[PDB]
Structure formats: C-alpha cells, structure tokens
Amino acid sequence: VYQEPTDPKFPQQWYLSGVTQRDLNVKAAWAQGYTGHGIVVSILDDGIEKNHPDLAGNYDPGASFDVNDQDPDPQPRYTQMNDNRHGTRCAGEVAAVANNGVCGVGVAYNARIGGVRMLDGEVTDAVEARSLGLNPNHIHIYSASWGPEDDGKTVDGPARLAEEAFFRGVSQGRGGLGSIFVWASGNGGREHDSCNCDGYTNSIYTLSISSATQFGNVPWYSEACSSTLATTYSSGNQNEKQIVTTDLRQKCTESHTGTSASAPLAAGIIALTLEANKNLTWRDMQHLVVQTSKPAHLNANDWATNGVGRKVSHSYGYGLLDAGAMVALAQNWTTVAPQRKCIIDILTEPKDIGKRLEVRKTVTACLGEPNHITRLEHAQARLTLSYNRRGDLAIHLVSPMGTRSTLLAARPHDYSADGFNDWAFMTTHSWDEDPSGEWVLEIENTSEANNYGTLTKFTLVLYGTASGSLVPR
Ligand SMILES: [Ca+2]
Ligand SMILES: [Ca+2]
Ligand SMILES: [Ca+2]
Ligand SMILES: [Cl-]
Ligand code: NA
Ligand code: NA
Ligand code: NA
Ligand code: NA
Ligand code: NA
Ligand code: NA
Ligand code: NA
Ligand code: NA
Hints:
Domain Peptidase S8: 13-327
GO molecular function, one term: nerve growth factor binding
EC number: 3.4.21.75
Strand order of the largest sheet: 2-3-1-4-5-6-7
Order of helices and strands: HEEHEHEHEEEEEHHEEHEEEEEEEEE
Bound molecules: calcium ion, chloride ion, sodium ion
CATH class of the largest domain: Alpha Beta
Subcellular location: Golgi apparatus, trans-Golgi network membrane; Cell membrane; Secreted; Endosome membrane
Radius of gyration: 21 Å
Number of domains: 2
Region (Disordered): 54-75
C-alpha cells in the first residue's frame, strides 16, 4: 500500500532508499506509517530559508529564533558567497516536503522543522546556551555540528551557560523526558583530530554521529573517538555520491558534504522513532541507537567486539543507523530505570607519566549503595595532567570486560604545553557491560622525544543502572 515519494531528486537520495542494501533503511520506517508527524526538529546553525519551496510546508516558527540579531526570524543573511546556506541544507535533510515535485524529501518529511540563526556572528557561551535552551517544551530534537575548531590542536567544550543548557534540556525539556541533542562528531580528519577533544560531541547529553562514504569507507574528514555512538552516510571521493537537499535561494543541491550532513539525517531518523513512541527519554533514545545500529559493510581497521557481544568502532560507533529497526524496537520499548552515577577517585598519589604510565584499579561500582551500577551506559575518565607536548599523548582505557577504548589518539599538530584540566574523556564502547572489576588506564608517549609530565587526578565516572539487561549478542 505504501507509495514511495515521487519527488524529482528522490531517486538520487541513495542513502534513503536503494536496492543496494547500502542505505539507512528509511523506507521500511515510512511503510510502517512513520514519517515524522507531530515531531519538532530544530537546526542550530546559520539560519533557515523558511520560505524555501521544499521547507515552507513543514516550517515551524515555534522551533526557530535568531540569536545573532535577537529576533524571531531565522532567515539567513544573503551574500554573494552564499556563506549562510548550511542551515537550509541541513533542514532539508530532516524535513524537506515529499510528493510536491520539488527537489527530494526529508527523512521525516512530515515533521515540523525550524532553525536557530546563531552561527552568523560572535558565538559566545550565552549564544550557545540560548540556542540549546530554545523552546524546550516545544522542540523535541536539536541538531548541531558546531564546537571547537577542527584544527587538531584544540581542546574545548561547553562553558557554564551551555553546560547548564544541556542539563536543563535533558532534565526538564520535553515534559521531563529530555531534549534530544544530536551532534556531528567533527570534520577534522585531515588535521588528524581526535573528537574526544571536542566537549560538545564528547558529552553524554549529545547523541553523536559520524560518517561513512557511499562505498562504506571512513571519509577523509572523519574523526575517530570513543564518544561517538553511530553513523550515517555522507560524502566521500569524487566517484561517490553525496547528500541531496534544499539549498539557499530556493535551489536544490546534490553536493552537501561532511560529518555535518550526517547529524541531520540521524535527527530525522530519531524523529521517526519518537513518532513511534513519544514517551522515549533522552537516554532511551541512546539505548535504541546502540541496540539497532548495524556494522555490516562498513570498513574499518578497528572493529572490536565488546563485553556484551556488540561490534564497535571508533570511526563508526555501533555502526549505521537503521530507521526500520529503530521504529520497530521503539514501539514496545520499556523506559530505562533512572540514571545512576558512581564516582570513583582512582589515584592516591600523583604519577609521573614518562614514556608510559599504566594505572590499574579494581572497583566495586558503588556496591551496596543506591548508585550501584551493574549495567553501564557512558563511562568517563576525568583526567588532570601536565605534559610538555600534548599531542604526543595517546590514552586508552580498558574495561573489566576487556573492552579497550581509545580516549585520545596522537594529534601531531597539538603542540600545547597546557595538558588536560579535569577533562572528561568519554566512551560509549562499554555500554551494557558490568563495570565491576579491574579498569586499566594507559597513557603513553607516542613520540621519540624525551617528554615529561604528571597525572594528578583520575576520576572514573560511571553512569548506568542495575536492571533490565538483555542476553549478550
Ligand atoms: Ca532575523
Ligand atoms: Ca520535495
Ligand atoms: Ca574536532
Ligand atoms: Cl552528572
Ligand atoms: Na567558547
Ligand atoms: Na574551554
Ligand atoms: Na568553551
Ligand atoms: Na526529567
Ligand atoms: Na555525545
Ligand atoms: Na572483546
Ligand atoms: Na567484573
Ligand atoms: Na585483568
């Protein structure tokens, strides 16, 4: 009975539907009757062309604001260079109108779509906070790709107002179920960037997404890190297709690219999922992504099986999003138990790093206490250390179940002598593992240089629950 969209560029949207099996399985969701009706998504970027012929029908002024000029109208600023086209491109990925003879379609082509104009000006902590915190009882899902420069030498994350916006969002947003913040993991591949150094994507409050090329490879621009959860398709080399969407000046583009094109596709899939079950919490949604995402046919040299039998990669997280599987699993999903937090201060004395430092600690994970965790979600190693050349460091963390997470890869351009100041390196790779037992932190100098420094604090922070586990995969 389901008739797929007739839009002129829909056949070019290879990632939505293909006979190849190299797609996001979105048609299967549409055929189950989920197209995003009733869900509200906001693009946090450089504005949205609200009168675009493929956006106007789904546009929601209630999901929109202009923080740069402080007015309700997120219309992009037009220039000869068309610099402010990115938000419009991303909006079309989520919610371009279907069956209207214009361009292609959004993943959630019946969802409502808005945009916050907030990148076209000075992006302060306050600007970020007011964008993240926009109308949080109306907007369900936020999509963003901003954060620290992808130069492979920066370490930065949300300051106080923005971090407060994240906690207010997931705590009180969406009727207490929590705002869904979908994030792109970064575009710094060429600079050998490592995305746990980006505190926005490295946050537990953001659902972080990386890219795969059409032929199933890790694109040139990709950043690997343990905080990433999953993957959607985006651009690659010049023989591979790219993302097809709405463009500035009421046009259509077939050349939208980069990890920033992956996050909106994920946001669209999450919109379909929320339509299938409006009662899903922000943590429920991350569980669904972990359980349903698919490694198959994604090529990486670092695929590893974790303690509960799931394949995970630092390039891809748990793999490609599967919209059909997401909406199926959502429908009778049982809400996860309240989030517990177990704080373990590991060191009894500072430790010289030298050539290599290994710190082993056996933990009980708050045994006997209300924060006892037997079922991990996110884990953080919050590290404070000095070092003379930061980018020469590589840091790994091994769970009791033997899952080795890369917290930090060598960053050749990072010459900083500033070290890390309580930086909360996060891994998703031990999700659903029992965190009781021996954890191992490894810090090593990857260079030949005689480097030096000291680890002064290592807090292992465990999040999760103590109930509801599945039989391991
Ligand atoms: Ca405006
Ligand atoms: Ca269309
Ligand atoms: Ca980065
Ligand atoms: Cl917390
Ligand atoms: Na900042
Ligand atoms: Na900072
Ligand atoms: Na900052
Ligand atoms: Na809540
Ligand atoms: Na994240
Ligand atoms: Na393993
Ligand atoms: Na154990
Ligand atoms: Na052991």
